[PDB]
Nucleic acid binder design. Structure first.
Lengths: 46, 93, 13, 77, 63, 102
RNA sequence: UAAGGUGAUAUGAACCGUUAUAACCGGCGAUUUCCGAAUGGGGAAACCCAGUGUGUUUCGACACACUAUCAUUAACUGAAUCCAUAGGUUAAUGAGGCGAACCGGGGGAACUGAAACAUCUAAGUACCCCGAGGAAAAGAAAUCAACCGAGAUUCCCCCAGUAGCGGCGAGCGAACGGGGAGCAGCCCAGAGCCUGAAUCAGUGUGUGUGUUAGUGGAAGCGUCUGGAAAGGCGCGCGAUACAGGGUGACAGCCCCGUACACAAAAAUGCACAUGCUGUGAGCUCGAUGAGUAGGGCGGGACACGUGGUAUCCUGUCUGAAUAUGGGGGGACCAUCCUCCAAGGCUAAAUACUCCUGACUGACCGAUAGUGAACCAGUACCGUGAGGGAAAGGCGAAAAGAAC
RNA sequence: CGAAGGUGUGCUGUGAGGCAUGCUGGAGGUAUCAGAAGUGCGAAUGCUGACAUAAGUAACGAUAAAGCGGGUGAAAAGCCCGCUCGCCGGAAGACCAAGGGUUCCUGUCCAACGUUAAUCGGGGCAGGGUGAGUCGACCCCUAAGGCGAGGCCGAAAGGCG
């Protein structure tokens, strides 16, 4: 039974990585929101 | 020019262990700790000057710090770099 | 804590 | 954008009302066109995206005067 | 040990820094690692001395 | 601006043994002082295989609040307070009730 | 300031200092790795790879600096055609990103209410986007009023659930006028006479005050109970200090504080006087904002849903007079009254608290109060946006139980 | 020479309640008269925690299978050694990539974890271990595709190139 999550570091970084968020303004707002909440992990860091 | 002071900081400490001892007595090589960057050229120059010995080749590797479970908390040790330095037929220390 | 160096080490088949 | 380079007219949103007074959002667009104006001071043609009202404004005033105002506005033409 | 070396020329300041880095900083570090050093308070004292000399060099050279 | 210092002979106002005289050895940042033969504690010292093997029960000194000890006058035969005054540009301590300099 | 100290969990080891450069606190400086607007190029963030210019141990190889984009300005170059322009290079100046609310503008719902529902309401609300400030916006009548008069804007209480609007349903809802807070008026569309002539902005000096370290700061003893008293009993003293906190049970007089009186080498905000720089006083004459006002068509805003609908704004098509002129006074006309649009600047009363200090509470006291009193936005869950806990209490003192 | 709270007892009022006291408790409580409420719980397939029931019941995760001797140990069917037996053998063997991130090796310990015991372990604690001019990454080149100086377009954001 193949499950939904099939890990891949390259796909994870290129999809939800820090640079991916900064590319668009919506991603920048995502980072801004999580800085405000004080989350330790801003994004998925390798 | 800060080469002299740079060479005085790349070397951190010698490494003591069973592998270190057997390597010294058999292969005439010293294993020691170096800075995180510590390029092979810098290590070679530092050993030549500070220890006043002749060296043949240097091999470096990076050791990842272990994850330790101290008390109610989880911690990690710092990564460090150790270098194997192969001395020539003339050895001092 | 986080390791960031998943470099490839392919031993010759 | 659909902005006149002379009068500054830009599209404005509004409503359109049916017989039953139903209101749906619409948008009014300026009557923009691309026109080449001959300028004797510089002896060449300048292309401006201007509305019909703006073209009347250019005729009433001088092309040189309008260009000066555009330059003072700070936008290249 | 702060104003004693304030009036020396830049040449001596570089010389004293080199011997501070050379001896009592590298040698003490090797001694401590090998376990032959019992007076560990020298390490911090030497480090602060190196900082003092560097502070003088910056306020001497250039600005 | 500490009224009780390293080398002072003091007396105890309140505690297990009030009125007992002594001399302070050290003061803690938490407003506590250590004196001889005033607050003795029979600590059960465990044995250790290191260089030191005390074993048995050790009669240690327990710190006491600085507020519970007052410097002794040594002339009037009673405890007395401490005040600060400037003399020849230096701040010095003095007693009260016919105050004299320390 | 100082006889103590080397941050905490957290003891130890090795040491510094005790009359002054131990430590600690404050001002001004120095250092300030890498990522991030990231800005030399690239990139899977904390990584990879460079070019040019300055100086150096074996050529080896090193150290530093510069090198993003955009806008403006200046210089040098420079096409299709002579000139020219576009374009290119160089140097300088400014911007870039982040931040809780408040402010202005550009867009703009639905649920719901109407006991259904489409006009309407919800509502110019939520939300998205842009720009600036410590406030912002608005602001010196082409305004009201009533033919009696007031004279910028803004905010609060009335007028008033009134007049009106409205499938005249649900609902929406003024103004005039009055009482207060605070008050300040100017400049260009231009010439002449007189030319620092007031007021402003930027840089020095001096006084005062405040912030950033601090200093002194009064006065209690004896017996009883008790593990220990600050309690009971008896007799005293301080108070421009019984506000608080701590101390072995409840302290004005044990400690830190408190009222009170003082303190600044150095950096700073505020109110004044005195210098410099730059625009700029006062009088005469003239001028006095045109594709605009207004109109037709379609919409929006004014309580006012096109209705008899004034007034304002605008997409589209037209289009005056210019002071012997024009606007408004709720369809419209005449007479009267009032004002002078089509160019701008302007603090005060007003809105909010991410953050700093003090103080307060018929606010909570660990299932409460912030999600978080315990290193919580953590553990943990989710690919991701995101969601999101549980967990406080020995004793006065570890004296934390030798054997 | 003992507050609140807790736990019993005895009186008392038509009631919700009140009063006195034994033991634990260890430092707070509050008359009377007024004032304000987060003011009273048995139910909402209520929310949170704790603890019952079924119950010492089902189950202990491929029907490839174990037996014995010795060793260590407080304790051995499961750990170590030895001799037999059985199972896989295009795999249930040996290698990688992806993905994990010290699970690797040695010493030591058996609380919890292991669906039982455990001296054993991918468990706890400590120490050790990853060596490249030739492998790979990095690097040079490019596919799909992404970004994109100027530029075109778009109320803003932004789209395309």
């Amino acid at each position: 039974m193949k499950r939904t999550f099939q890990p891949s570091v390259l796909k994870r970084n290129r999809s939800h990585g820090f640079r991916a968020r900064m590319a668009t303004k919506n991603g920048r707002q995502v980072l801004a929101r999580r800085r405000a909440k004080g989350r330790a992990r801003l994004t998925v860091s390798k | 020019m800060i080469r002299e002071e740079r060479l005085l900081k790349v070397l951190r400490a010698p490494h003591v262990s069973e592998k270190a001892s057997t390597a010294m007595e058999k292969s005439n090589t010293i294993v020691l700790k170096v800075a995180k960057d510590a390029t092979k050229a810098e290590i070679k120059a530092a050993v030549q000057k500070l220890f006043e010995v002749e060296v043949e080749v240097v091999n470096t590797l990076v050791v990842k710090g272990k994850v330790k479970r101290h008390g109610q908390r989880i911690g990690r040790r710092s990564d460090w770099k150790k270098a194997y330095v192969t001395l020539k037929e003339g050895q001092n220390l | 804590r986080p390791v960031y160096i998943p470099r490839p080490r392919p031993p010759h088949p | 954008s659909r902005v006149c380079q002379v009068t500054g007219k830009r599209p404005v949103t509004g409503n359109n009302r049916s017989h039953a007074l139903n209101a749906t959002k619409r948008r009014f667009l300026p009557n923009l066109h691309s026109h080449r104006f001959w300028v004797e001071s510089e002896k060449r043609f300048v292309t401006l995206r201007v509305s019909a009202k703006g073209m009347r404004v250019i005729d009433k005033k001088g092309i040189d005067t309008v260009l000066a105002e555009l330059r003072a506005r700070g936008e290249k033409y | 040990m702060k104003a004693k070396e304030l009036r020396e020329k830049s040449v001596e300041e570089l010389n004293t820094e080199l011997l501070n880095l050379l001896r009592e900083q590298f040698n003490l570090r090797m001694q401590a690692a090998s376990g032959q050093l019992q007076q560990s308070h020298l390490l911090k004292q030497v480090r602060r001395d190196v900082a003092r000399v560097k502070t003088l060099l910056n306020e001497k050279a250039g600005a | 601006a500490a009224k009780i210092r390293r080398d002072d002979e003091v007396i105890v106002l309140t505690g297990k043994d009030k009125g007992k005289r002594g001399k302070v050895k050290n003061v803690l940042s938490s407003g506590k002082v250590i004196v001889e033969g005033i607050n003795l504690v029979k600590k059960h010292q465990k044995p250790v295989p290191a260089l030191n093997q005390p074993g048995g029960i050790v009669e240690k000194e327990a710190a006491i609040q600085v507020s519970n000890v007052a410097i002794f006058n040594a002339a009037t035969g009673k405890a007395d307070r401490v005040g600060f005054r400037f003399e020849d540009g230096k701040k010095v301590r003095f007693f009260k009730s016919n105050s004299e300099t320390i």
